[PDB]
């Protein structure tokens, strides 16, 4: 998780299986990891488990339920404004915990399990030390931003791009999570 | 699964090799001008830099290439032939102090291994240990810049 930050990916379902599970809403596959590669019939992104809750961006999850073994699970938290939604972490997952060291050197874990360095420039922004095409970042919405210890600093929200290259990324600080839970 | 680090052997010694940018690098003081084995026969080094202690053959099968560091952190981590990770404070562009010194036995056979930044990106290649009374408390390394340079 941290020291150093390494990560791997594993696909667990395909197109046809996903769809049935979307409708059915019942998912019996075994869960493992802090970040789940989430998908709707509309688009695919990421969900990150932090302190017992599985978060992701509202602009991807909407107010949908999450397919689980015991059927669909309604969202625990929903904040259109914070652009966050959260369901209790799937049984089997591992949660990250909020960063407590204020490090400005964040590491964005992408949908392809590539952890990349971003330097914090604002309360909700960091710049890529090595800009990349946005196609790379595509699908990594909801992914985590880790401080050098492997703790959640925020969730990837949008790419600050131009000409198709991404120079920075906007994120939702873990602070917004606490606010959102205290909110609704 | 694809391994980024290969554990290699020579008639006399065993060391490591690290795949970076499609090349499989190691220490010349281990490999020499040797060829790497392949199910199609011996492959030759694409790169030989006897001055920097660096050699590279094209990446073998079952390997994954590491990404060079672009954050320039000083908090490095060394992975040994036994898969142990060893924190290292980058003192210079080619040297670091183990945050906790270990007997050379523990670092033995790990030359060629990767020096990783907090993002697990290749900062350099482990070249040799720096020990006082048989206790490694520092290591020399070939920075990736050199590797990228030789390409």
């Amino acid at each position: 998780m941290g020291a150093p930050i390494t990560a791997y990916a594993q696909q667990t379902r395909g197109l046809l299986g996903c769809i049935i599970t979307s409708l059915t809403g019942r998912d019996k596959n075994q869960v493992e990891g802090e970040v789940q590669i989430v998908s709707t019939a509309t688009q695919t992104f990421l969900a990150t488990c932090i302190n017992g809750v599985c978060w992701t961006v509202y602009h991807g999850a909407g107010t949908r339920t999450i397919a689980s073994p015991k059927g669909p699970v309604i969202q625990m938290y929903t904040n259109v404004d914070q652009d966050l939604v959260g369901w209790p972490a799937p049984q089997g997952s591992r949660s990250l915990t909020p960063c407590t060291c204020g490090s400005s050197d964040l590491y964005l874990v992408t949908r392809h399990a590539d952890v990349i360095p971003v330097r914090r420039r604002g309360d909700s922004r960091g710049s890529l030390l090595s800009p990349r095409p946005i196609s790379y970042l595509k699908g990594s919405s909801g992914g985590p931003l880790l401080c050098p210890a492997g703790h959640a600093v925020g969730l990837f929200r949008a790419a600050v791009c131009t000409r198709g290259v991404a120079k920075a990324v906007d994120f939702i600080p873990v602070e917004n999570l606490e606010t959102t839970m205290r909110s609704g | 699964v694809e391994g980024e680090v290969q554990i290699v052997s020579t008639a006399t010694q065993t060391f490591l090799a690290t795949c970076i940018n499609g090349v499989c690098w190691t220490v010349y003081h281990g490999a020499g001008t040797r060829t790497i084995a392949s199910p199609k026969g011996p492959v030759i080094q694409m790169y030989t830099n006897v001055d920097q202690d660096l050699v590279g053959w094209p990446a073998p099968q079952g390997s994954r290439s590491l990404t060079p560091c672009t954050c320039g952190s000083s908090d490095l981590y060394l992975v040994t032939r036994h898969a142990d990770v060893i924190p290292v404070r980058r003192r210079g562009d080619s040297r670091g102090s183990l945050l906790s010194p270990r007997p050379i036995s523990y670092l033995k056979g790990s030359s060629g291994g990767p020096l990783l930044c907090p993002a697990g990106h290749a900062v350099g290649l482990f070249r040799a240990a720096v020990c006082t009374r048989g206790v490694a408390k520092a290591v020399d390394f070939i920075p990736v810049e050199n590797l990228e340079t030789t390409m």
């Binding site: 998780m1 941290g2 930050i5 390494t6 990560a7 791997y8 990916a9 594993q10 696909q11 667990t12 379902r13 395909g14 996903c18 599970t21 979307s22 409708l23 059915t24 809403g25 998912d27 596959n29 869960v31 493992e32 990891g33 802090e34 970040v35 789940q36 590669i37 989430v38 998908s39 709707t40 019939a41 695919t44 990421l46 969900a47 992701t56 999850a61 909407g62 949908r64 339920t65 999450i66 397919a67 669909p72 799937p90 591992r94 990250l96 874990v109 949908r111 399990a113 992914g143 880790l146 492997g150 | 699964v1 391994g3 680090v5 554990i7 992975v79 036994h82 898969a83 142990d84 990770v85």
Partner: peptide, 23 residues
């Protein structure tokens, strides 16, 4: 209601260097 969000994969951070088993 609309479709349920489906977990189609995972990304594991807990992982640590390991010698890929000969098998």
């Amino acid at each position: 209601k609309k479709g349920s969000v489906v977990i189609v994969g995972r990304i594991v951070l807990s992982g640590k260097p390991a010698i890929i088993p000969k098998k």
